[PDB]
Structure formats: C-alpha cells, structure tokens
Amino acid sequence: DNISPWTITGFADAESSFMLTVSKDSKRNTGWSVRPRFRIGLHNKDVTILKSIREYLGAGIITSDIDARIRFESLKELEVVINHFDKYPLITQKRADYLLFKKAFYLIKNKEHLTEEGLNQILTLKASLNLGLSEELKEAFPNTIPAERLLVTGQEIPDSNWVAGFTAGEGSFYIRIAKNSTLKTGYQVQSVFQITQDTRDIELMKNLISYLNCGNIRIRKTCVDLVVTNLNDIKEKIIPFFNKNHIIGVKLQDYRDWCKVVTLIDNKEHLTSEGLEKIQKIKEGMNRGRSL
DNA sequence: GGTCTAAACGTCGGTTAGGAGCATTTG
DNA sequence: CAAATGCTCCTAACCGACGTTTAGACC
Ligand SMILES: [Ca+2]
Ligand SMILES: [Ca+2]
Ligand SMILES: [Ca+2]
C-alpha cells in the first residue's frame, strides 16, 4: 500500500533535517565547499518507512549501519524534495529552516555560491539555520548578519494524515501501571496517548488538541507534551482517528497492542489479577520491550 | 472510608536531529 | 584542473517511554 504525501510531511516535521555544510576546501576557487542536504535518520528497525518515502518521491539514497538514513544531496533529488514541500508545506518551526534551506538551494543551483558575495549570503542563511554557525565559521566569516528567520505562527492542521505522520514520529502509545494500594488488585492501569514537542511549537500542540477535541498540555522541568488519559476520549476519538489515519513503522504494532489493552480496560479486566497479569504481559513486549 | 479514574508530577537514556569532511566521480 | 556528489564518521539533546503521587468522583 502506498503512503500519503501529508503523512510524509508530518513525519518530516517530526524527524527530518535541512542542512548546509560549509567546509574549507583548498581545491576550490573560493576556498570553500558549500552543499545543501536533506536527510531523515531513524533506528534501523524502521528502514521500511524510509523505503516507503523513497517509493513515493522516486528519489533518495537509503543506507543502514548504526542507523538507517535516507538522504538527498544532489541537485535533482533536492528538486524533488522542494517540489514536495512546496506542494505540501511543513507547519512546525522546521518550516522556517526549510525556507532558509530553499533560499540557499537556489543560490547553489544558479551557481552564484561560487561567488564570494553568494558565499557570504549563504553563510547568513546557515547562521539562522538549526544550530547556526560554529565558532570556526564565525571567525572565518567575521560579523556575518544572520538571515531573518520566519516565526511560524497560526499554523492550521492541513490534513489528518499530517497528524498520522507526525505522531508516527513523535507520538507514544503506552500503558501506565501505577503502584496504588487503594486498588484491590494492587495497581492502577491506564491507557495513555502522548505527543512530545519542544515548547517552540506549543501553539501548534494546543491547536492540535482542538483538532482532536481531547488532551491536556504538560510542561516538563524545555519540552511540552500532549497527553490523553481519558479512557472515553481514547476509545471514541483517538483510536478511531488512528484507525482511519494509519501509523507507520513498528509504532503501528505498538499501537495495536495498545488497542488490545484499551479493550481489556474497557471490559474492566484490569480490575482483576488475571487481567492485570495479561495486560502486563502485553506491556512488557511493547515499545522499549520489543525485539528484532 | 473504599475504590477507581483522571492527571499532575517525576525521571531515565537513546533514537533521533544535526554536524563536518575525506573520497570518488564528472567534465 | 575544479565543481558536484558519494560515502563515512562524530556528537548529544529533544524526544519517547516509563514510573509515583495528588484531587476527587461514585458507592
Ligand atoms: Ca522532532
Ligand atoms: Ca521517533
Ligand atoms: Ca523524534
């Protein structure tokens, strides 16, 4: 089965990266090598996801060593990328990065990066891209003025598949077992849906809650979480939503086991010892407890 | 009070993100 | 020759995922 473009975009909002490498090359006229990259790096166990992406865009190089990566570094591949994200725009702060990247791309495509002016401009672009300029690049290009970075605000959810890809990237379906003496079975069993993101896009997360009509915002001791713990919201909103909008990767399997446990909780089997052992058995093989 | 649900509060460790540069091809 | 791209190696935090305690409904 083929993947949705908005799923690709959501997942990219989650896990992808737009990069500019500027490295001193003595074998070049400007004395510098400038190259744009787009990349997605995952755990090996999710190679298939990358393949799916590769199948949709018809571009990208997939490798697998200590991790699995799909990369786009040549001009043509990057054209494919830019086409996709122009048709299907990111909505997190990463979009900003994309724009910078995009600008840089066109400077390199038109070869004016081989000009010192072009080089300097590209350095202003990298200055505001992700982690910005290293100390080495800072001293190599003194007092470069960081390009204006677009603050991504008022981002409406473009598509439900975007949500699917995004939680496929940052989401978490897990079962919480709490040591509670008030429970005659000895433990409280909770089904929990979660999405984690840096505070920079808290607005989006809030706008996401309204989209799912459930969830609470949690601020950590930094990061922000969309947390769904209400069983009825889970059974009536979340589960149907992700049954319609599929989760890719191993997290799909995790989500299935999660679903099974939710059904066990709905039938109040979590209130008995037998059902508790059952649920625990399912949980031990979920997420961090899964194998090859 | 007894019980259970929802969720606020807490915390670990690694899969993500982000990085830089040599090697090879293209020309 | 030089410019583009292929390929490989390095770094660590924003994530994922796990745990306990608190407010409070029904009975
Ligand atoms: Ca992310
Ligand atoms: Ca992930
Ligand atoms: Ca992630």
Side-chain angles (χ1 to χ4, degrees), chain A residues 15 169-170:
Chain A
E15 316 288 79
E170 318 281 46

Short mmCIF file of all heavy atoms in Angstrom, two decimals, chain A residues 15 169-170, chain B residues 16-17, chain C residues 15-16, ligand 3:
data_model
loop_
_atom_site.label_atom_id
_atom_site.label_comp_id
_atom_site.label_asym_id
_atom_site.label_seq_id
_atom_site.Cartn_x
_atom_site.Cartn_y
_atom_site.Cartn_z
N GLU A 15 10.85 14.30 12.15
CA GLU A 15 12.15 13.63 12.21
C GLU A 15 13.20 14.11 11.21
O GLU A 15 14.37 13.74 11.33
CB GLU A 15 11.96 12.11 12.02
CG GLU A 15 10.79 11.51 12.79
CD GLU A 15 11.04 11.44 14.28
OE1 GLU A 15 10.91 12.48 14.95
OE2 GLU A 15 11.37 10.34 14.78
N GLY A 169 6.05 9.98 14.17
CA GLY A 169 7.38 10.45 14.53
C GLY A 169 7.62 10.74 16.00
O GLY A 169 8.63 10.33 16.57
N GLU A 170 6.70 11.47 16.63
CA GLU A 170 6.90 11.97 17.99
C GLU A 170 5.95 11.35 19.00
O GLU A 170 6.09 11.57 20.20
CB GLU A 170 6.72 13.49 18.03
CG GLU A 170 7.35 14.23 16.87
CD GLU A 170 8.84 14.40 17.01
OE1 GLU A 170 9.54 13.43 17.36
OE2 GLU A 170 9.33 15.52 16.78
P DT B 16 13.90 6.83 16.01
OP1 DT B 16 12.58 7.49 16.09
OP2 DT B 16 14.01 5.52 15.34
"O5'" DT B 16 14.94 7.83 15.33
"C5'" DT B 16 14.53 9.14 14.93
"C4'" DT B 16 14.62 10.12 16.09
"O4'" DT B 16 15.80 9.82 16.88
"C3'" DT B 16 14.78 11.57 15.67
"O3'" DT B 16 14.26 12.44 16.68
"C2'" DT B 16 16.29 11.70 15.57
"C1'" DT B 16 16.71 10.90 16.78
N1 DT B 16 18.10 10.35 16.70
C2 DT B 16 19.12 11.08 17.25
O2 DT B 16 18.96 12.16 17.79
N3 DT B 16 20.35 10.50 17.14
C4 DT B 16 20.67 9.29 16.56
O4 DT B 16 21.82 8.87 16.52
C5 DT B 16 19.54 8.57 16.00
C7 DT B 16 19.75 7.24 15.33
C6 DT B 16 18.32 9.13 16.09
P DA B 17 14.18 14.02 16.40
OP1 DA B 17 15.19 14.67 17.28
OP2 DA B 17 12.77 14.44 16.50
"O5'" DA B 17 14.63 14.13 14.86
"C5'" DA B 17 14.82 15.38 14.23
"C4'" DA B 17 16.08 16.06 14.73
"O4'" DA B 17 17.08 15.07 15.08
"C3'" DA B 17 16.75 17.02 13.73
"O3'" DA B 17 16.92 18.28 14.35
"C2'" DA B 17 18.10 16.34 13.43
"C1'" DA B 17 18.35 15.56 14.71
N9 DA B 17 19.26 14.42 14.56
C8 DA B 17 19.03 13.26 13.87
N7 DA B 17 20.02 12.41 13.92
C5 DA B 17 20.97 13.04 14.70
C6 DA B 17 22.25 12.65 15.14
N6 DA B 17 22.82 11.48 14.82
N1 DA B 17 22.94 13.52 15.91
C2 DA B 17 22.37 14.69 16.23
N3 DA B 17 21.17 15.16 15.88
C4 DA B 17 20.51 14.28 15.11
P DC C 15 11.57 17.72 19.77
OP1 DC C 15 11.36 16.95 18.52
OP2 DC C 15 11.17 19.14 19.81
"O5'" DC C 15 10.84 16.96 20.98
"C5'" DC C 15 10.25 15.67 20.77
"C4'" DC C 15 11.31 14.59 20.71
"O4'" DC C 15 12.21 14.70 21.86
"C3'" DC C 15 10.77 13.15 20.76
"O3'" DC C 15 11.47 12.33 19.85
"C2'" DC C 15 11.04 12.74 22.20
"C1'" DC C 15 12.37 13.43 22.43
N1 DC C 15 12.74 13.57 23.86
C2 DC C 15 13.30 12.47 24.54
O2 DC C 15 13.46 11.41 23.92
N3 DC C 15 13.64 12.61 25.84
C4 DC C 15 13.45 13.77 26.46
N4 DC C 15 13.80 13.86 27.75
C5 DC C 15 12.88 14.90 25.79
C6 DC C 15 12.55 14.75 24.51
P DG C 16 11.06 10.79 19.69
OP1 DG C 16 12.00 10.00 20.52
OP2 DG C 16 11.08 10.27 18.30
"O5'" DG C 16 9.56 10.76 20.27
"C5'" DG C 16 8.82 9.56 20.32
"C4'" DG C 16 9.41 8.60 21.33
"O4'" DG C 16 10.03 9.33 22.41
"C3'" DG C 16 8.41 7.64 21.98
"O3'" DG C 16 8.87 6.32 21.83
"C2'" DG C 16 8.39 8.07 23.46
"C1'" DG C 16 9.79 8.66 23.62
N9 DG C 16 9.92 9.62 24.70
C8 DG C 16 9.25 10.81 24.83
N7 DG C 16 9.58 11.49 25.89
C5 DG C 16 10.54 10.69 26.51
C6 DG C 16 11.26 10.91 27.71
O6 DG C 16 11.19 11.88 28.49
N1 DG C 16 12.13 9.86 27.99
C2 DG C 16 12.29 8.74 27.20
N2 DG C 16 13.18 7.84 27.63
N3 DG C 16 11.62 8.53 26.07
C4 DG C 16 10.76 9.54 25.79
CA CA D 3 11.64 12.38 17.26
#
